[PDB]
Amino acid sequence: SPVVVGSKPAQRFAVLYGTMCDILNGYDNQVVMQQKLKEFIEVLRDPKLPYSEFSAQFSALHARMPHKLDAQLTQVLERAQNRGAEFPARQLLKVFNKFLDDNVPNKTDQDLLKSTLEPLTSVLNLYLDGQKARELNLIADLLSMYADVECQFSGRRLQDEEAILKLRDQYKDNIQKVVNTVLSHKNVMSKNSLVLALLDEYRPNKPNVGNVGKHLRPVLRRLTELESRQSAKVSLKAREVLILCSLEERTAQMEHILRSSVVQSRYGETGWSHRRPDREVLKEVVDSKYTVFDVLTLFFAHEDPYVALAALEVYVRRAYRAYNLREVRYHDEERPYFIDWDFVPSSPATPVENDFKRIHSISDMTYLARRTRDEPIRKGVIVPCKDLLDAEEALSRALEVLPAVVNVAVRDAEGKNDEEILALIKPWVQNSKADLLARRVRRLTFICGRNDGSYPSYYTFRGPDYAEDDSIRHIEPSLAFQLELGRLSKFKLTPVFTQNKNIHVYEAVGRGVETDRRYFTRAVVRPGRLAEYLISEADRVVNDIFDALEIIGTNKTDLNHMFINFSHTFQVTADEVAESLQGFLDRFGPRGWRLRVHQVEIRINCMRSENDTMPLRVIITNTSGFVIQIELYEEKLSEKGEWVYYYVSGNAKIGSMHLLPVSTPYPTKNWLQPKRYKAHILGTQYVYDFPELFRQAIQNSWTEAVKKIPSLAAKQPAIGECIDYNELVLGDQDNLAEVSREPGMNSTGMVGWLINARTPEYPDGRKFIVVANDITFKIGSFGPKEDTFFFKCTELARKMGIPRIYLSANSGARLGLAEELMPHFNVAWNDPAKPEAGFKYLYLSDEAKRRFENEVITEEIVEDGEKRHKIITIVGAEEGLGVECLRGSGLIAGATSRAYNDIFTCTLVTCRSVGIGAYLVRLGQRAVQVEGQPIILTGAPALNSLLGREVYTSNLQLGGTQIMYRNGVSHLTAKDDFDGVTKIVQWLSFIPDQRNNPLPILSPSPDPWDRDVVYTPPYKQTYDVRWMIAGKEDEDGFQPGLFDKDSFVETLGGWARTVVVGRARLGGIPMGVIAVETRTIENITPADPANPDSIEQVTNEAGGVWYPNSAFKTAQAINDFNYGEQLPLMILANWRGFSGGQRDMYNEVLKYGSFIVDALTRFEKPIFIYIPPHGELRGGSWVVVDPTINPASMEMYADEEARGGVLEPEGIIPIKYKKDKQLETMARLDPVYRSLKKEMAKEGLSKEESDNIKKKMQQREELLLPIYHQICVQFADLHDRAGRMKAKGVIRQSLQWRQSRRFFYWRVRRRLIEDDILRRIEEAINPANTSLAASPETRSPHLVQLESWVGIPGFKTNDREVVEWYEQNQDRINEKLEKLKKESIADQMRELXXXXXXXXXXXX
């Protein structure tokens, strides 16, 4: 069949709209959605279509009514087709109205014409508006057609089509329409894909916010209400477009500004053309809030060569904003592009990290750190190319004006070239591999300008061969500082496609470990508005990321993060922003939770503080499945020249990440363990694992206490919350600061924590400091930073009063030499040919001398005619090589010595503790040693090398447990690192939470106070005195001691076991215990391997005697229970004197004996000396323990059946009851001896007769002598009896061992409280003993005042009655205190010529 010459595009337009009409109306016609849509857009844009639609219809209508009109219309069409392009639609309207409805007489006899020319009239009307407006007509029709059918299904509660059909019963015309609308809804899936493809095509609403945009504004707003699940996705897309409803008009705006820049008016002059572009006008574009890069890409292009220059200026000034300005030079060569700009503030600028003097690039976080004094400026070059092939000529010729950073623009938005464009830019860089290299340029960018508002694609080549870093893509090597990326350094990053060019998603996998697979998002937002704006801007950019993470998928990701940088300097403060944050996070949260996103970081600026920015970075983490991790920071520099994370958040400062650089490289997965490994090879836990060891130990302290003591158990604080620690790291002004940061990454070789542990004694909490060395951080050696640290912790624990715990694992002081001077120093020999012939000295070359000078003290002496700088002393730049470490070591040494005498001090040998470390163990006095860790002074191989022979092999052979516990350096032996902590937390249970705080007393509970002491020692043989303290575990039942069942903890019992020391509880009251071992113990000292003859020496320390080592043990213990611990004491005095044996005398027995007396005068808390049953206290022993030493705190008691005299009754008898004295008493009691005495006295008997009486008596006296001897022994023993002691007032009372417990419980408690009341009396009176009579009933002069305040008659006695009075009248004494406090104020103010000065001081 024949066809019309020009009807191809008309017929092709009428089918491509029809192939889309069938899908929207719900018919089966399914044809390729993307291709037929683009073909419809390509037939609405061609100027031939209006003519084509006319030529088809008019051909049949030529032979219609009055031809007069038919011919005149044809003339217009034919002329407009060749001459000019656009269709004369409006001319064709005018001619038809004039002839048809207007020329009623001739043209239209009757109203027939209207119907005939109707198809032509429906052509000149769709084109009257225009050709592109005809395109918009058939996109205000297909974007209304969808809404028309779908809205009813999302309509007035009708979600059912059948219910809808019954509702439709209303319209007659809807008879056919009922089914048509139902047919459409069924195939909505195909419809959604068509509308979405149409919404994406007209999405460049940003460029044209009028032609394609305003025309579509109302017919698109009728597409956001469709929230219904089916249309949900399409409604969201509609919203995107509306937000956009500028660049088309901006094309004009910027074009004008560039041209206005060129020729400055300055009316009254002929030639402004030559004048280069002016800042004032161009400034408007460069500093604008709007995106400029989005359109600018076409202006360097196809324009006047001068305008191309002006555009290049706009671009440079906008991007290199953070950078500095310096001479813009435009040269006009073959390619008029040549913009030569020169210039980085790097310290007070953008939040960056600067150490010493250094300046780095935006992308290159490592340029040249050395310094920027001997470094060039970075010469710029930006070229506008037209084609990709032609671009090469703007490279080889471009580079010639470079004696740095270079940018290259293009004009071919033809296609979205990827990989092929990368294969089209790489042949130009590999060819000029020496050309770009010679000029020393680091960065090269390639901008590709798209005309439909698509953000241009950037490709950057960096390094020596310029391998092209895939990291910087579709973004500028300037916008890059804002992208950071220097935080994902420990990750192999590879980016993935993003629909939005602002956002860049990166695949990150740990450099060491590949398991860690995370999607890190990096976005830079440019807020282009003309406080609620930024929070609404956050919703737009986070939604963009959520939709992009959707298409890439959640896949397999452990964690996901997204960074959103705000280029805006808005006036707000974080306090209100913290409330608005809460609002949108609960909505986005569930979506972010599916994508496996764990945290989000927002970096905003706040001009309102100064009217200068306060950059507030905020991290929101979804931890434990809970957020609440809303940490609001502040970008402030640490003084150290670095920008740190100073948070003033809302999660109550118990947060994470604090006072940390902005350059942290987001720690990966597993980075924690290799560190653990190096500690574990040494048999010690990694330092940061210890806080949790303590938690389990406290957890354990409760689980046992709840058993023994029920009821008082419910205050248990679960598994967690047992302890509440926070790290310690040196502050700004070297003043320790509480930080709650991630474990590991310690700044120094020492770490500390402030722990608030809820112990069962202090269930509300108790604090203490824990200091430990990182054995991984340089062998755990003691450098100056480590020393300054340790000190400031000691200082802190002291300030409070809370105990200190040191965990030792070190290698003495630090080691090093000057490494830098090793491959530079020269030698001056006696003879240069034979260097073995001795060397004169060591010198340094003049050129190598200037390199250091301050690192070496060099003297000048000319030898061989050379300027030789002989080294007279080496200094070295680095710290920790000599004396610097020793100075610090001595300081902390002193600090620990001072701390021991003030607060509770304790150390733990978790691993090898050498040199200084070893001493801090002793200065720490109270120490626990783990079975496989030595306290060594000098290295075991170092000793062998010095002696010349292999004597010692093990560091334990001289530092181990078998030495330090057996000599009293170690107080206890722990099987493992935890066992240590366990036994320590145990000591802590005996000690008050603070310094001058009441003891950790409990209810009588495991052992009641009102029980009699069952175990009584056998008088014949020896007994384990330990049984008298805690109790004797016997075959037949269990006989308890005078202290609580299972409460005793023995210490130092491996050295001088002749005295037993420990801590125990008396009816809940904890106190110090010292007792005398009765059994003959045998300590055997080991043989020294150093002297081969030295043998193991046998020493049998017979029980109940004081030896040099026993005395020292006694003395040490007294001071230990006195300083820090502050415990009451009980001494079961049972020594019968001292060993005056030569060896023991020479072994300075007397020196340590005095040390008991010294230690006793220093004590504050009450001390009880109780001689137990069978217990003895003769001569030398008594003296060093008598209450008159410290009558203020000592109290002495003796058992009813105890003994105490000047000497043993066996010793006194040959001095005061000699043989002659026994015979005078014999001739008195014995009847036989005095009868025989009557014979010799009367005489009258011969020489043989007198011999008889002599030989009769000296036989009778020989028989009576052994029993008469024992009589005097008993007689002498009656002197050393208890009754006598109470009678001469050397003891307070005679005590029955059975009811010792019962007496002391109340006497202990009575003295505890009384002592505190008296201390309080003095604190109020002045806010600043003398005889044998010094008895505790007269220990204080206030015990007279307190006596009358109480009102109890038997005050000095009836201990129980007294205690109970204080407890009741705690208010009445606080009444007396304040009375006296104001009375003492009156005395000091009255005591204050000096009156005339006071009458001047008052006037002031």
Author numbering: 788 to 1032, 1036 to 1133, 1153 to 1212, 1253 to 1379, 1386 to 1464, 1469 to 2187, 2196 to 2259, 2300 to 2311
Article excerpt on this structure:
Biotin-dependent acetyl-CoA carboxylases (ACCs) are essential enzymes that catalyse the ATP-dependent carboxylation of acetyl-CoA to malonyl-CoA. Eukaryotic ACCs, instead, are multienzymes, which integrate all functional components into a single polypeptide chain of ∼2,300 amino acids2. In addition to the canonical ACC components, eukaryotic ACCs contain two non-catalytic regions, the large central domain (CD) and the BC–CT interaction domain (BT). Here we provide the structure of Saccharomyces cerevisiae (Sce) ACC CD, intermediate- and low-resolution structures of human (Hsa) ACC CD and larger fragments of fungal ACC from Chaetomium thermophilum (Cth).
Using molecular replacement based on fungal ACC CD and CT models, we obtained structures of a variant comprising CthCT and CDC1/CDC2 in two crystal forms at resolutions of 3.6 and 4.5 Å (CthCD-CTCter1/2), respectively, as well as of a CthCT linked to the entire CD at 7.2 Å resolution (CthCD-CT). Owing to the limited resolution the discussion of structures of CthCD-CT and CthΔBCCP is restricted to the analysis of domain localization. In all these crystal structures, the CT domains build a canonical head-to-tail dimer29, with active sites formed by contributions from both protomers. However, MS analysis of CthCD-CT and CthΔBCCP constructs revealed between 60 and 70% phosphorylation of Ser1170 (corresponding to SceACC Ser1157). The CDN domain positioning relative to CDL/CDC1 is highly variable with three main orientations observed in the structures of SceCD and the larger CthACC fragments: CDN tilts, resulting in a displacement of its N terminus by 23 Å (observed in both protomers of CthCD-CT and one protomer of CthΔBCCP, denoted as CthCD-CT1/2 and CthΔBCCP1, respectively). The CDC2/CT interface acts as a true hinge with observed rotation up to 16°, which results in a translocation of the distal end of CDC2 by 8 Å. Analysis of the impact of phosphorylation on the interface between CDC2 and CDL/CDC1 in CthACC variant structures is precluded by the limited crystallographic resolution.
